[model samples]
Target chain A: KNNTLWTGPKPEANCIIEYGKQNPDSKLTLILVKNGGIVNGYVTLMGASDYVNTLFKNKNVSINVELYFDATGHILPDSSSLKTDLELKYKQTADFSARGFMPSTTAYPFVLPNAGTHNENYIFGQCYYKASDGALFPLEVTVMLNKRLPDSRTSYVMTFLWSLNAGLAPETTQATLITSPFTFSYIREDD
Target chain B: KNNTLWTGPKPEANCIIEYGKQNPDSKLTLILVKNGGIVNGYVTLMGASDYVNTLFKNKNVSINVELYFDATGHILPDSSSLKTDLELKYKQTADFSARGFMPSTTAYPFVLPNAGTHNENYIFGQCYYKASDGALFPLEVTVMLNKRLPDSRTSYVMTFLWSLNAGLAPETTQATLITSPFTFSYIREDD
Candidate 1:
């Protein structure tokens, strides 16, 4: 019998990601459930965690991704209106990356070179890691925004180097962990 | 986080009893879960591992008792037909003692003469214990009578006994180490 199945509730707050690795060809999928319901939008990838060192100077990592409310009361589309709002309030650029899930065999691609180099046009929402052997690792990012906007921007509010390997899996293997239902309040500016 | 809930298909063929013992004043409650569903019959209490000697030799120990069926369904006068059918075919019986749930200061008045006589109809579906102190014990008996009743009553049939102690707190503790559900076909002998 699996003893893990009977263990109690969710992890405590302030849980940080340490180092994480996945098996070859393993798929990491992130789904957001809100209010006992599943929200639209999902990120899937294979083998993104393999090149963590190349992605950043330190192996440790902490990332914050925003979940926006679009005009239809769901995630908003990436655009200038949403991006400008995110930059003015959150002071971060929002952008999506397919390269994040791409194979790490090549050099890490830099989406942003310097702060204020790119105008607030797109919002960032999620990040994923694909391991060299084809496993995918997805992290949940929480953001705090003032108002619920249809096309809101999710900037990198803050990023911290994390060990990644220390993060523990949720107690209940069957329970789905979602992000939309959680509210992320604003913290200090990101370095 | 809470563990994942188990939601899967039922097992092929399995009958398990979830039994419990209450205080001296309450009834011994046995819960029957067959194929993941509760069986529609009474829970019969039998001797524990030491029941043969404890009940027959000394006749001083208390046996835990539990009834599985809903009292509303099994106790109703109108449900007698269904109850009789279950008793005859399934050999299911409910046993309860007045002091089964309540603890007492005085020695309870009860005794079991012999092993053979202990199997009498009075003990078939009734619960008994010493009145002095309330310690609970229970048994789950499942008899199978597949063949039709013979008019002459001369056919020999087999009977199996699955006896175990369900412990003192039947309501709180899970019933483990139970007698296997058995089968038997017997002929009634004339006096």
Candidate 2:
């Protein structure tokens, strides 16, 4: 009877991620919500904390190759006519534990890298790690973009993906594709 | 920097709750997902776990009066011609913590009472309590029904509400209305 679903820290903003239709267990929609200034949020990798930690500990993981995103287009915001380029980033930490469904809260605060990058015609990839252990690690990381929703109705679409290769050499070609074929909706909250 | 939206346990399902448009903080759309057998799920009350434990400890709380649900209609399953009546229940336990945003993992599985009830024209209500404290309590409760989504396409509509009136008497007349007038889509996962 210990059937709980989401286990992690609560984010401040309440944003919604409308995932493409899939099975209950694997459909990784509903990301941690966020508010104000950029598309900031967190994504839980089900229960892969330990595996992620091991990859980091072994030094076989390439941060940029593991997690990244690419904006496909925008509807209400005119994806092409934006004045500034969209940017994305991932945290360099991880948490491994025996607590929540996705126990480890390792990935925190997905932010822009020190070096700014363009969002269009490019994939914001590679977030280096600074963790020590690999036991019971959870892929709990925040995803932040350089843009914000103009209002509640304005939204942009993009594709975000992550890969977890156990060996020292992370798998780049076999990365798990999320937002399949451009359906990642970044809708804003009124707050 | 510590901006997470949902902080609790993870359920085994991937159901999405499309909430009526609202601000980031007040809009409570996405409930914990559950698959197979009834509309089983969980709802997090942002950061109100402690307050709930206190209400329970003071013995000034009515379980059923605090949390409950009412079915409005169904589209594919034909709300009027459902074979079985839908019933709802709230766990008698509550957990208070200083950890997650909604720190307490109090309410567990929202199940049905031993007593049978009709769904088409009923509001399953009144769950008694059996908790000790109310400090740092999060209103985390699992909501379960006796019916299943026939498939990924078939879903019913209902309004699930919860009220945390301090003291022994819960705010029944002013319960927080979720699914705001019949838009709770119980979409089933293909799992």
Candidate 3:
């Protein structure tokens, strides 16, 4: 069971946004799980493929956002101090994520974006988009930043979310403020 | 803990709906968090406060239901499935209820009155939180016959408070009720 993907979860991300138009046909719908905030999940992307390409000079569409986690020793990289240390060593990426809930993670390689950029400051994670059509639209795949423990959820540091919109113009965009579970999924079988 | 709440992982579930013909005023109402809330959120439709008055169908209404997620994964966000679910179920009433509202046009099979029937559904995870009294209020709530998903039988709805926001048939008058959490949890203490 290497890091190759086997199958993704169901209800594969299907949400959207109009370039500048808000029609029932061009709405953006995001779904967060029951608990507070999610470490990561899926994003449904919808925009007139033609118009979006026109608006952003045909660059690939993507989203880069921030994620927050508990600071104590319970999770991983424990504190902000070590988080950065791990990032520095791993190319701004942290091995602080998991495939399972934790020690019992049947999913051993679940990894969420730890550091990246959207509007730039520090990006917690990101998604890249392909296809003018949606087959490649919704990023239906993996995330690994959920380290839950009752009280750990009620306490967080910060979280900011902004879409990259790929070569588009939006120093400002809708960003997620809070989260609950990361994203749920089944682990891959041995290859 | 009280039946109203229990210790959850991230943001606790804080909301309700009188599925069994509870009463319009007591229709769909939810929040990922309450006075002490969840990390993120859902989509439920509830009846109005002065719901007792049922006049001719000339009253124009509209809403902005939002979906949220912590967005875990390789950032492989998915946007599929549910479209079919929502489509097959509420197809009839949605197209006719409203139009000026694109990206999201109209209502669903219309609002179901409160009787004594209660419908329930399970949820994937939940929203746990970090604060109290600062939770975001209900925004897009108001609904009718609900279709429970088969998986967990977990009832999930989009709930947002509504009011006659303003204007015409070509455009639904309800405004968007949105508020993201503060990036870094903090105190103003400036006063």
lDDT of 2 by residue, B40-119 (tens): 23343221223332333332322221111122221232221212222212222222111222111121112233433222
Error of 1 at B130 (Å): 33
Q: State the displacement of the C-alpha of residue A90, model 2, in Å, after optimal TM-score superposition.
A: 30
Clashes (N, CA, C under 3 Å) per candidate: 61, 46, 105
lDDT of predicted model 2 = 0.25
User: Candidate 1: lDDT of B77?
Assistant: 17
Standalone chain B TM-score for every prediction: 0.19, 0.25, 0.20
For every model in order, the TM-score on chain A comes to: 0.24, 0.25, 0.26
TM-score of each: 0.19, 0.24, 0.24
Best by lDDT: 2
Error of 2 at A145 (Å): 2.4
Predicted candidate 3 versus true structure: per-residue lDDT over A50-152, tens digit per residue: 3433333323333222233333212232322112111111121344332221112232322334544222222243233332221112222223232222234
State which candidate, 2 or 3, has the greater lDDT. 2
RMSD of each: 24.2, 19.7, 21.3
What DockQ do the predictions score, one after another? Answer: 0.01, 0.01, 0.01
Superposed by TM-score, candidate 1 places the C-alpha of residue A186 at a distance from the truth, in angstroms, of 19
**Which digits, one per residue and each the tens of the lDDT, describe model 1 over residues A1-191?**
11001001111121212233222221222222111111122222222233422332223445323333322222232421112121110122343222111111112112444554432322233333333332224434432222222222433222211123324322211212221111111221111
Per-residue lDDT value at A119 in model 1: 29
Task: Please write out the lDDT profile of model 2 over residues A113-144, one tens digit for every residue.
Answer: 44554333233332122122211111222233
